[PDB]
Design a protein around this ligand. Sequence first.
Ligand SMILES: *[C@@H]1O[C@H](CO)[C@@H](O)[C@H](O)[C@H]1NC(C)=O
Ligand SMILES: *[C@@H]1O[C@H](CO)[C@@H](O)[C@H](O)[C@H]1NC(C)=O
Lengths: 105, 99
Amino acid sequence: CGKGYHLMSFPQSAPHGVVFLHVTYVPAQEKNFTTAPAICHDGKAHFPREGVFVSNGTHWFVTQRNFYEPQIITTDNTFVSGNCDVVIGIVNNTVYDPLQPELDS
Amino acid sequence: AARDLICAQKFNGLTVLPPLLTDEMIAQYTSALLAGTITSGWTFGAGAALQIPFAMQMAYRFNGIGVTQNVLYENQKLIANQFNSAIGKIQDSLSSTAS
Ligand SMILES: *[C@@H]1O[C@H](CO)[C@@H](O)[C@H](O)[C@H]1NC(C)=O
Ligand SMILES: *[C@@H]1O[C@H](CO)[C@@H](O)[C@H](O)[C@H]1NC(C)=O
């Protein structure tokens, strides 16, 4: 169903045949980022639920894979599995908790 | 020595034509496909090739089949060793078995 990520298709009739118009999705403009498999925080390893950890040089974000939409790394979009001693390439960062500012107010 | 079968075929009007793509170009296409698959993943089949580390690409492949991606990050050395042993077994079975 065409080249790219398939979205739509429309048929047309032709003499002794059929013509498919395939509507597909192609990524266009890219950028380089520094990436990590996991994040070490409080002696724990955080992995993204869906997406990927990226960094522009200073801060770390989590984003979806097929579009650059960075977000603040939070316990809502990450899950915890083990400590930091078994993952090759784990980095040190902080993980935001939404319950802590709501507790203090 | 003696007359070949190929000369007897050629002396009666039967000719074998060469293919358009030589084996060097087939190997070049295969090498390009391997390099794109190893470096980029499946992103080179939908447009421009986008680089990713191979461990993170394999974690994407683990998430595709229903296994959570921390399994690879905790058993990466075992998974790499099993892959290397399987490739060596393919090597040995191709060196021994001819059928
Ligand atoms: C990313 O880095 C590579 C290597 O340094 C460079 O060739 C490329 O232009 C950079 N930018 C993009 C968008 O790929
Ligand atoms: C991350 O922090 C720990 C202590 O919390 C430290 O031992 C470790 O070296 C740090 N990692 C890096 C890459 O600096």
